[PDB]
From a paper:
One of the most common forms of DNA damage is the baseless sugar moiety known as apurinic/apyrimidinic (AP) sites, with an estimated ~10,000 AP sites generated in each cell per day. The primary enzyme tasked with locating and processing genomic AP sites is the multifunctional nuclease AP endonuclease 1 (APE1), which is a key component of the base excision repair (BER) pathway.
To obtain mechanistic insight into how APE1 efficiently binds and processes the solvent-exposed AP site at SHL−6, we generated and purified an APE1-AP-NCP−6 substrate complex for structure determination by cryo-EM. A subset of 58,854 particles was used to generate a 3.4 Å cryo-EM reconstruction of the APE1-AP-NCP−6 complex. Interestingly, only the catalytic core of APE1 (residues 43–318) was observed in the APE1-AP-NCP-6 reconstruction despite utilizing full-length APE1 during cryo-EM grid preparation. In the APE1-AP-NCP−6 structure, APE1 is engaged with the nucleosome at the entry/exit site with a ~10 base-pair footprint that spans the nucleosomal DNA between SHL-5.5 to SHL−6.5. APE1 binding induces an additional ~20o bend in the nucleosomal DNA from SHL−5.5 to SHL-6.5 that results from a ~7 Å movement of the nucleosomal DNA away from the histone octamer at SHL-6. The APE1-induced DNA bending facilitates displacement of the AP site from within the nucleosomal DNA helix into the APE1 active site. The void in the DNA helix generated by the extrahelical AP site is filled by R177, which wedges into the major groove of the nucleosomal DNA near SHL−6. The APE1 active site makes additional contacts with the nucleosomal DNA at SHL-6 through intercalating loop residues Y269, M270, and M271, which wedge into the minor groove of the nucleosomal DNA. Importantly, the APE1 side chains that coordinate the nucleophilic water (residues D210 and N212) and catalytic metal (residues D70, E96, and D308) are in position to perform catalysis on the nucleosomal AP site, suggesting our structure represents APE1 in a catalytically competent conformation.
Residue numbers in the entry:
A (entry chain H): 32 to 124
B (entry chain D): 32 to 123
C (entry chain K): 43 to 318
D (entry chain A): 39 to 134
E (entry chain E): 38 to 135
F (entry chain C): 12 to 117
G (entry chain G): 15 to 118
H (entry chain B): 24 to 101
The structure:
Amino acid sequence: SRKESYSVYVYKVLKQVHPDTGISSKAMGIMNSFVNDIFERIAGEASRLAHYNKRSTITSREIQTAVRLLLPGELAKHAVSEGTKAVTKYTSS
Amino acid sequence: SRKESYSVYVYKVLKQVHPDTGISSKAMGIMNSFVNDIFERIAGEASRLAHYNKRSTITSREIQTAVRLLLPGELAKHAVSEGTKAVTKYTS
Amino acid sequence: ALYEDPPDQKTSPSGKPATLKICSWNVDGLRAWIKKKGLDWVKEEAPDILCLQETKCSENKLPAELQELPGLSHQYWSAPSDKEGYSGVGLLSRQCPLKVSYGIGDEEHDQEGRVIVAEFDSFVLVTAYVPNAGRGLVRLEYRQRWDEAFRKFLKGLASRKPLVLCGDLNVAHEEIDLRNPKGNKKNAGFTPQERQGFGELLQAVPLADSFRHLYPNTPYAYTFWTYMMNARSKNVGWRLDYFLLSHSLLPALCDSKIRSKALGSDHCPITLYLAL
Amino acid sequence: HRYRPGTVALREIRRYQKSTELLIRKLPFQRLVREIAQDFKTDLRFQSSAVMALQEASEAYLVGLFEDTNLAAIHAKRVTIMPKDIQLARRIRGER
Amino acid sequence: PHRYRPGTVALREIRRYQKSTELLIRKLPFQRLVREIAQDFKTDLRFQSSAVMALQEASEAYLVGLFEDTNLAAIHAKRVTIMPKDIQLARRIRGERA
Amino acid sequence: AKAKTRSSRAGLQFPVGRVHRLLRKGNYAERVGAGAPVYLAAVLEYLTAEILELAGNAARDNKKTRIIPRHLQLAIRNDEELNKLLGKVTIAQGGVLPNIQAVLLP
Amino acid sequence: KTRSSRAGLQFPVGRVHRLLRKGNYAERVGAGAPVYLAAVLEYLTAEILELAGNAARDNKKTRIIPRHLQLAIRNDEELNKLLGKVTIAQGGVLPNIQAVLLPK
Amino acid sequence: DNIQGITKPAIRRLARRGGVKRISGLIYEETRGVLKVFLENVIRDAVTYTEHAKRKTVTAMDVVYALKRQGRTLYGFG
Amino acid sequence: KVLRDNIQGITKPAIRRLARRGGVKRISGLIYEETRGVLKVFLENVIRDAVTYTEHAKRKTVTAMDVVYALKRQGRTLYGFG
DNA sequence: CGAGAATCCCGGTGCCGAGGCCGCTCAATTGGTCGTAGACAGCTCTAGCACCGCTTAAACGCACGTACGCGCTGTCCCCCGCGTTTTAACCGCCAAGGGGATTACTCCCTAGTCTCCAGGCACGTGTCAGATATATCATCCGA
DNA sequence: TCGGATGTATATATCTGACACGTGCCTGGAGACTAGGGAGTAATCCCCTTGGCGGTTAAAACGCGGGGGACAGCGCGTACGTGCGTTTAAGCGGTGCTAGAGCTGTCTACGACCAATTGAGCGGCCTCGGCACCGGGATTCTCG
């Protein structure tokens, strides 16, 4: 029927960061699998964090802590900084 | 905060297997953690199977497949046999 | 390695000022060279006459950078009929030549796109892209036959007005003309056969090597550097590009330059100053 | 006229490193996969992408094992790779 | 006067400390080490005794496993003396440093 | 009515009801089948019986009646299939299995 | 209007939120969690794609293939830690010849 | 016995990409056992997944799930 | 009160006893210095996760449960604590 | 081969925790309803399997030289075993304070429901990046 | 020291089939409004961690043979790579043909859910027996 994929969004990101580079279909499938796997990892860690504290919500606190736990040092710091900027940007409006 | 650990059940199983053998508190803690970890593994694999096959419930077949995936060798063969025997007795 | 070309001498031995500046450059793909902004360099050099070799471009494909420069407005182009993408020469001039012709005798049947002849008031200019002997010397015998044909052709021309011959003559005449002489024992560009051809060219026409005339003992002065092994970075090169002159023009010779710093090809420009 | 033993071997290592090919004949691998899977369940149908995925995983695992074992053999003051080195690498990786 | 040969005591000891199941590391130095390591992340923490014991036990298990693996590596190289490069090999093959 | 627990009904010893409650509260799926807790409890009691039997054999070997973590650790390591099920698991205060490489022994 | 545009992202927020509930991770999902996670995901591939093509542009090509992703990930020092266990289909291998093998 | 289908040159070439300059005469016979064991390990889980799904076509994604359970995560097929 | 130079507290005989339990017969002198770094790295990796876990719950005491979960993150799965 | 050191065994002692007991739970069980999901039947198109023929890249058996794996020898150096001197761990003891569970209350954030629309997914299509293919040295081996 | 065998940087001429862009439409996302249950705040108290003092001594630190093992060096001979003719089976191109994968249409059984209820299970308290240990003697290894 329909396929749910991140092809469009990864293409948009590639255009934003590299305005003159194309991406083949295979590298597209790899970038989809990467996004799906990272989503699974972080969401599972957030769910486990919520379970441990006898809490029944996945909010920004659980996500940030899971991101800090999974990603290594510089990636963790940059990712949490960018995520906090985005969420403050969203809640402002 | 009652903790509801698997102490009584594990003690009953020992008494069944060995009638004249005790078990210390540290060994009780080891058995509790073992049981919790195995339960978590089986339940997680069952949920993953349900989600993979677009299902929405955990029937006994998902548990059977999860046991077959986790336990290596003969352990799988005897675990599934005793589980299906217990289910068959339960239904009737 | 390194070499620094000495300053431009702009007066002749008898003290007459240079009135004519000719630049020759094997651009090794004219289009690419223009994107390598080789025309910006040409504008800075402001020659009266520009000779280009290995344009690898038919006249219909010339970049609109053609019109960009008003001063060089008289332009003549040649490309091979059956080897598009190879050879190709051009001649661009501030003043209009009296006569222009192409090839060395039978271009109308063997359109090779290697040679342009332009006659001016006081001299005849020939620019050439001499055929390479080829990797493994596969076309050395052709090159030898071509050298003979060319020599005979030029002999005729020089019989009238003085001659200036410029371009890529695809030989390093003597050991001083390349970095690795024995390393190029039988290699294209340094075979005994090609070197002898150059010597016969000088003796028969006759012609003088302007640069070596002025700088007879100067080593490490090259005009071509192999793209591979960053030989340009190391100055591992050869002198393949020349201005050869009739003996009667030597009193008019002010300087003969090698423009080592000008990028955009695996050859650099060379420039001649004459007092006419 | 034969190139010396070091020169041709490393000529091969450099080519086989940059290439990202499959390096294993596909039909023999497909037959091997069918023969092994013949045991667990009879009369199975393998999708082509499944065979390709198995081949990709097999190549990755074998290449990793061969790297880990080259390190093991090199440490023993020897360049020839021996089966003892593979066995040691497998036991250390906790895969035995 | 009577002195044992260079390997006997060494083997008596493999056996005794492979038979018994104590901690093998003094408690206070390990606790101070854990506190020092943890002060670089969050200031003024208050560890529980059970947490320090768990860290101790995990460290002993990890170090014993590493030593067994590097002993296998050293034996593979036709040697009995354990050397640091063997430890580096064991860590590399598992894939921890790299 | 008369009340008979599913743990007794199925002939097991682990509590089917507690397993059922953990399965729902654990957020593994929004629906839980009827037989899933029974099957899972049967598997759990089987595995526990096996490891306890091996531990008891090891303890009786050492002329000790009680089971301590050392006995559980020898029972786990000496068997082969239990060992790869619990390959990446360490038992607190469990010690190590006594094997010394034969090269080291003259 | 769209939540992704409101928060200044490129990855979808509605899709992530739908996954966050449908995946049965918790009984309730906060409002800021999808935005935070979408931002993290966007940053991660922004990084992978930024590396991957340099690693493509150095080889005179303009198209990213699996080989360039394998090079970009392996050449990094913490992305390799993140993706140590994963294998990329026909990703080849980093060129690494051990020293002894090179005859001195 | 198609483990014989994994020929000596193919094993040699896999070693070359792994970065091995000299190969003994027993690896060819030894690595086939490792390869066979490795496949058995992934083929069992793939067939179990397919059997549970009540299909009879081992799809590529099932193989992907089978690799993922053992830690050998694979990208590109889903 | 801040602490300094505590990695030397893991004395040489402790390393010797650990190596004996591992089953080694002869130890070189440069092993002690290698293991005091290896164990430091391992402890740093575990403590980072434990402190993250305790900080998320807005606590100030590293409960044994936190260390157990930090270990389970790296695939060690200690048994006997909680 | 025998004196000496390490180890196992035989047993009384005292200690502390494993196991049983009793009171009090709170959640597991019965018995009903009721919405829905997945069991089951049925249908269509897809791709997986078997076959055949041709090309040719590759696998194979064979010689041959050589280089490196392993064995042996000698050397020296450095780690172990033991004895002597610290010294800091360990046990017990105390006080102190702070923070981690608890109960109560409130409030506000999200699930749910409904309606409306736009963006993104499948589908077609024109264009051109990549794959060749042809021209135009320098450096590193074996002798 | 030199003659022969491999990397090897730019540039242009075709083929192609595969990315990149119109497009349309429908399905899932977006906006509004409500209920209510989860979570944050507030106060408390008690127990669990920190710190500090003193005594005891097991364990660590240090020094010194010396002997066994790490390591360098020589030799040798057998296993492996290297090239080459030959055979063999893998691609690759149809070609067909049917199992069955994937989707859709009922609806019946099955599990979520709520009102009682009671008994399996948990917390606090003995209490006697398993077990570590010291005291001593007999047994086994070990190296000169």
